[PDB]
Amino acid sequence: KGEELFTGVVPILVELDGDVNGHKFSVSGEGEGDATYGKLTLKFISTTGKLPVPWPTLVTTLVQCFSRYPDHMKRHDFFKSAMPEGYVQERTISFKDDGNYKTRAEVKFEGDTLVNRIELKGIDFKEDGNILGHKLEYNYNCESNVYIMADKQKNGIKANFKTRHNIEDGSVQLADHYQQNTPIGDGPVLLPDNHYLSTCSALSKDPNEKRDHMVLLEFVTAAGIT
DSSP states (O other): OOOGGGGOEEEEEEEEEEEEEEEEEEEEEEEEEGGGGTTTEEEEEEESSOOOSGGGGGGTTTTGGGGBGGGGGGGGGGHHTTTTOOOEEEEEEEEESOEEEEEEEEEEEETTEEEEEEEEEESSSOOOOTTTTTOOOSSSOOOEEEEEEEEGTTTTEEEEEEEEBBBSSOOOOEEEEEEEESSSSSOOOOOOOOOOEEEEEEOOOOTTTTSSSSEEEEEEESSSSO
16 A cells, blocks of 8 residues: 555655764755655755764665665565555664764655654764764765565564765775664555665755755665566
């Protein structure tokens, strides 16, 4: 039933409240998703405290229901199956040789609009590390595979993946992601066979925007099953 909600272009709202090493910030995003093509277009704006971390480190936290599942894989699409009631998405993101984010989000429809509401908590970051020191390039050079498995005990899914963020000196900052999703509602959901999401992201700037912001274009396709 949920998959029928994604046959067209769907408006998206994203709202994040963050605290990283006591630095508080908030992000608001707007855009749209077209799961027929695995396509996301989103613009995010920082609305309160000076963004204490680099924009690229927030991409994965800031709607996998917009992934394109090939027809032969549609029985493996947990994300759409949980809609409209939605799912909780939780992660631990471990930055190598630095701190960690713990994120808790609720993704669901509010009327015709797909909403992602997030609380992010970061601790153990180094003052002159790549994150608090703002040493990461404004790009997303790595196309990551999100490896998904069923979690039948919790009627949901688990995932793990690595993202690699370019450092301004040419090196790379690794971020290990562990993820758990569970349905909010009491409808049946689809519990998938092992597979992955191939995720390609591109960051840009709005030349007329004076606020601290990030424009994101993303294509996401489910794969790993013939």
